[PDB]
Design goal:
homotetramer, Peroxisomal Thiolase, Chain A, domain 1, ten-stranded mixed sheet, two-stranded antiparallel sheet, about 20% strand, binds coenzyme A, acetyl-CoA C-acetyltransferase activity (chains A, B, C, D), Thiolase_C (chains A, B, C, D), Thiolase_acyl_enz_int_AS (chains A, B, C, D)
Chain lengths: ~400, ~400, ~400, ~400
């Protein structure tokens, strides 16, 4: 295991709906809210920060190296280096494990990690404006599809990759809608019971102060879902009611060496034990969590049943159900407060977001299980990434 | 310092000029050429590759997670994961150190690292086409400037940060042009004497085979540079003649553990010793190599004089002269075959590119210096990154 | 004056607001509605139609020669020719006089005239996409401003030409708002009392049937207008409240020789007597009706006092008040049911639209004035055009 | 016949190739060259001008009412009114007959008529930038096709309408290429013999002075043409060698009443006798000249064989051959100096251009035929327009 890496804080913005409450807010701006919050919760002096690593997928028109922009505007000294990564939906979680690597090697004693995404403000592009089209029409490309949600390999939406999982693996419409229903009910109940209150950092729009995850649909019913029309294929199983949302949010965590945390008198929340990534066939990219988790299990000597709580992102109900079946997930310990379907899925953010939700869930009074947590998600182009943690108490 | 990381191969495409010989080729296409070449030169079985990490800055419209596209189309199994990283001009060098970190930690035994950029095919963006402009003009933004060459913090060009270095630190027009002149002459001579022949991997365009760096200008004279008008400020010192080019290329290296290389019968070319990044004031971003190298020296106990050869990227002569002065570079051992001014500067590629040139330079018959190599470059937003190598012989 | 030209029918669509009830409908679609209605009201056999002339300003992206599209989709034989005409806000009125000229000369016995505009669907233009921008930002131009509402000569808005009239000729903010207020009240009352019912041709949207002018604001008060901020200049007088609307509509009339009407058994509604256009200084374009009407008076021997009703388009209250003062209008006989401020101003349509409103107004039971009608409007680039009619009874 | 209308002067710019010699010159700017020249050749005092009427097809991004822009910048007083028309390729010739109508009715004693077109600078548009695309791609529309060269009715290029003429009417490839060959040879010989010298007005590009029609191909051969690949349909007959060019030019004529010309001591060049337009099936829009000419013949009592010279625009060789066959054209009197194929076809200009070429041809010493001239062209959407003249001597 990594032996020297702890999480000392975490924070996420509310999750906005597509063209919703954060439509007038950049990914950088959401990123700043989250990082400022993470720094304050850790009580880390900003001159102890060694690096900032942020996932961000849809970067067109956002300006230079968005991680660096966020850092400079969260009160982090200009002397601290920063870079941005893209592993699509894996981005925010691979940012965390890259940061953990920095600390475990002794290249850093404190790293800010996270992810951000404003899918609302992914722009449109034209490919041939530099040297000209000469004659004939061109395409006005939605970068959220071109550079995000469309499989570059196959030329179809991620939602078709979900239908592939449905076809090949026999995940029925009823199963998908059941998963979707449970996710909404869980998210609604969690919200109403204050389960998200502490982890959320409010976003002030200069004024309106946004505190609530706006994508949850508490009025969701099994019958309502069954009426919906397929979204990606005619006579399909995947709908808008059982696919993840398109959303806007950011999320950040402060990582530290054990020795640095001790020196600053900062209480460690959790250790990071290890991480893994793995590739799969792009056409069934939803399966990525399965080899990613297996690899993580071989590196750590853990098994699925050892985890007290598990976050496996719901990109599509077809995907989430298949992953949970094959890994032998306990659904009473997996995605307990909803996930991508209910809360939403801002793609560069979600990897750090699910780790943040896991951490706060496991930190709650009365959690006296194994104290191990697992986070994993699927990734367009056919990948998965995962991280194991153990709470410190 | 790192004890277990070796470079076993390196390759780069030739470097195209802006809107030049690679205008019809994508970043991803160049990446594939470089990665295939690196793999062939290593003789590494593709099922021994653990991860791919590629730097790439101007990603708008290029499709999903371009490192993954490159891997899949270079014959690497779908099971291998990949991610893309943006540290502007640092990207390709930071990709190398991130990959080294994988191996040093034992998370991987073989990683593909590098970078790629097609500045020619960076698209134009429309910011408010999703929810509408309503009334009134918008901006058609050139992503190469918005997301690349314009300082998001100051809102002026990288060239103006070059002027700032000239203002504050008194690097004169004449000094800038001498540097530029020597760069052009060094590159011309190197290209004529065959110095780049082995490192270059030819690009086939469907048939034309491209084998040569396009951007070098052997006709350059001190008297010609002196007549050029300032490109960034009225009555300025920075000109198209003493500024790096805008360019297209890709570059890749194969890294391995010493153990895996020994297992496979593959001979190491160089050890990676260590790395360092650092931040500076965005307005004088060109100063970034100075703290990055000092931090690297502090981590390794090396000094500038210990290097046999040095690659410090010439983003602008003003910047390069200042860094070399401040670091006490021996110009007979620094940038001996030219650099960004002459060879060109495809921003996401250059960090790996300079390391490949350094490696092949030090590997020439007749070299018998320290066998230590230094690569560093400056970064928009005020950063530097650096790597130290030692040839294996 | 003309001795052989009669109007036998007229129809207009309701007038939509900007991005309003007709946002999903093309100019051509509205044109078809109006032309079909006009043809049905005339009872003219379509094989008796000799030509179609339609005004239309913002034609970008609408396809080929839109008058011809309208004719073909209104059931007019392919054998009938058509052309489109642009005199900005004059277009639809100049279309009428051009058609009258056909008949007076004996080149035609029956012509379809009118105008159409969908300011909502005027597109955005990219100027250098054919041969390339090469490097550097461009402009995404709103064609409604570029090709419509911005003075190409001065490079400022039509609203600023309105300010110029206020500066030079001292039409005060209070005067502007009184005009605007009376316009809104006149239109509200007219619409409520059924005045527009017969002239309007309903628009079916595939089902929604649209029958009502959208833009009127019956809640307008002198006190409300007085609180509005200037829309075109800092510390100006012209506001969104005392300025014409941006709007969508179409309007058509059927013109015939007296001989053909008598042959077909079709009863004439009005004679067209004559027409006139004139130019003025672009910077005070709102003054255009003054020389156009004087030239018309000179050609006809009529005077302002001889008209029973007058339509002088309210492009801006500043402009309308100045014209009415200079021409000695009787405001109890001028714009009696509102005009551009209240009903709205779809620029290529309005010239025909005001003539249709004038015609139906004078045709009301109980009218027993001179039976002479005057229509005129101002034109960007510094023009006016006018038509005089006399009802047949 | 019209009895009171004469042409007192004419002028045209050279005709530029697509993205050629006038690529950096607007339609307005070419228009100004032509109008200034026409005014000077007439020696008409500018305060005797009553109206300006200019054809112009592709008006996107050109600014307000381009006829008015041209007038103001050709030294015509601001008091003179102007409008722009669009009848696609008919535009420039219908402008002439509309102007003649103004004079014959006694509404004007002097009118400037013409046409202009910069097909090079027709821009690209996006249809849904005002209210947004929300999600998914859009189209970047080439307005030269959308609003120009594509049949809006059928959704295919004008070149397909030419293939329709070829299919239905049996105009072979060999016939088309023969027509094309003859057109090039005629144009080359005419140019080389100075036949275009007087009519051309030189265009100074601020410096290079352009005097030559640049589209002519004197190296054209029957064999060369036979090698060319179809341009519009697979296994088609229509090629780039036998279709009109895409081009840039302008052209203007001064018209006057007989009485006004006498008063000013301006010698009339030709009388305009009459005009006609007619519609046809859009799919065979090339046939438009046939009914247009027939109608003109019935109005005038002229027959085809009465014309000393004839201009029938070559939009496509298939079109021109069919029109000439059906009208019984003498090819030794028809298109004697080439036409659309050789000289080019700037669409809003060509209608006035062919009348200008006709007028100068008939004015040459040694032309002592009937003194009657005919001009006619086809029009997308299925129309034709024609004008008859008689030289005065
Ligand atoms: C599926 C998708 C295309 C739908 O997007 P959308 O149409 O913008 O979605 P909306 O939230 O507006 O919902 C669409 C409709 O579905 C219905 N709907 C959605 N969720 C529902 C629910 N829980 N119950 C009932 N109806 C529901 C609604 O009727 C809604 O229309 P309405 O609210 O205007 O009446 C989009 O969410 C998507 O692509 N998701 C996947 C994202 C993804 O691939 N991420 C990466 C994965 S690795
Ligand atoms: C400086 C810059 C704007 C020049 O762009 P450009 O104008 O397209 O450059 P070109 O190579 O076409 O040079 C323009 C002219 O300069 C002249 N020129 C350039 N190098 C010359 C040399 N060595 N000798 C003589 N003249 C030279 C030429 O006249 C050339 O015109 P040409 O086409 O007739 O040869 C651009 O190179 C730039 O922005 N560079 C910096 C990139 C950067 O910031 N990277 C990131 C660093 S962190
Ligand atoms: C003036 C102009 C810029 C206003 O455009 P806009 O801002 O889209 O106009 P809106 O109708 O949305 O008005 C903006 C605000 O003004 C206020 N307003 C407008 N008319 C009002 C009235 N009668 N009473 C009170 N408030 C009024 C409202 O607050 C409105 O906001 P809302 O949406 O909450 O009602 C535009 O109408 C214009 O350019 N007009 C002139 C067109 C022209 O030049 N034509 C050619 C003439 S030759
Ligand atoms: C047919 C059309 C699409 C071709 O446009 P284009 O490809 O840009 O044309 P070019 O002038 O570049 O010629 C294309 C190729 O044809 C060949 N060519 C053209 N004319 C030739 C000739 N006379 N002899 C030999 N080769 C010829 C050339 O090889 C040329 O390629 P190259 O010169 O680079 O070797 C275009 O001219 C067109 O659409 N014309 C019709 C316009 C129209 O419809 N107007 C309205 C009518 S109502």
């Amino acid at each position: 295991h990594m032996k020297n890496v702890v999480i000392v804080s975490a924070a996420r913005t509310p999750i906005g709906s597509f063209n919703g409450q954060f439509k007038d807010v950049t990914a950088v701006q959401l990123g700043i809210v989250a990082v400022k919050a993470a720094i304050e919760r850790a009580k880390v002096p900003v001159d102890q920060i060694d690096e900032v690593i942020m996932g961000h997928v849809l970067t067109a028109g956002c300006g230079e190296n968005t991680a660096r922009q966020v850092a400079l505007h969260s009160g982090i000294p200009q002397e601290v280096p920063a870079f941005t990564i893209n592993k699509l939906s894996g981005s925010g979680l691979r940012a965390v494990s890259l940061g953990a690597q920095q600390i475990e090697l002794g290249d850093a004693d404190c790293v800010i990690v996270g992810g951000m995404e404003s899918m609302s403000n992914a722009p449109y592009v034209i490919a041939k404006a530099r040297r000209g089209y000469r004659m004939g029409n061109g395409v006005l490309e939605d970068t959220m599809l071109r550079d995000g949600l469309v499989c570059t390999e196959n030329g179809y939406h991620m939602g078709v990759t979900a239908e592939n999982i449905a076809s090949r693996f026999g995940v029925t419409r009823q199963q998908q809608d059941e998963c979707a229903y449970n996710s909404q009910m869980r998210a609604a109940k969690a919200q109403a019971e204050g389960k998200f209150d502490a982890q959320i950092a409010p976003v002030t729009i200069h004024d309106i102060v946004i505190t609530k995850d706006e994508h949850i649909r508490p009025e969701t019913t099994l019958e309502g879902l069954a009426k919906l029309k397929p979204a990606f294929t005619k006579d399909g199983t995947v709908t808008a009611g059982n696919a993840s949302g398109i959303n806007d949010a950011a999320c950040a965590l402060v990582l530290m060496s054990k020795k640095k945390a001790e020196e600053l008198g900062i209480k460690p929340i959790a250790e990071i034990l290890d991480w893994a990534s793995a590739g799969v066939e792009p056409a069934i990219m939803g399966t990525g969590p399965i080899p990613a988790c297996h690899k993580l299990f071989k590196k750590t000597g853990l098994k699925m049943e050892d985890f007290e709580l598990v976050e496996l992102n719901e990109a599509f109900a077809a995907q989430a159900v298949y992953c949970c079946q094959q890994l032998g997930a306990d659904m009473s310990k997996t995605n307990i407060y909803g996930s991508g379907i209910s809360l939403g899925h801002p793609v560069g953010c979600s990897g750090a977001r699910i780790l943040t939700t896991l951490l706060y869930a496991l930190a709650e009074p009365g959690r006296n299980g194994s104290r191990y947590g697992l986070a994993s998600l699927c990734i367009g182009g056919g990948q998965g990434t995962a991280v194991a943690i153990k709470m410190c108490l």
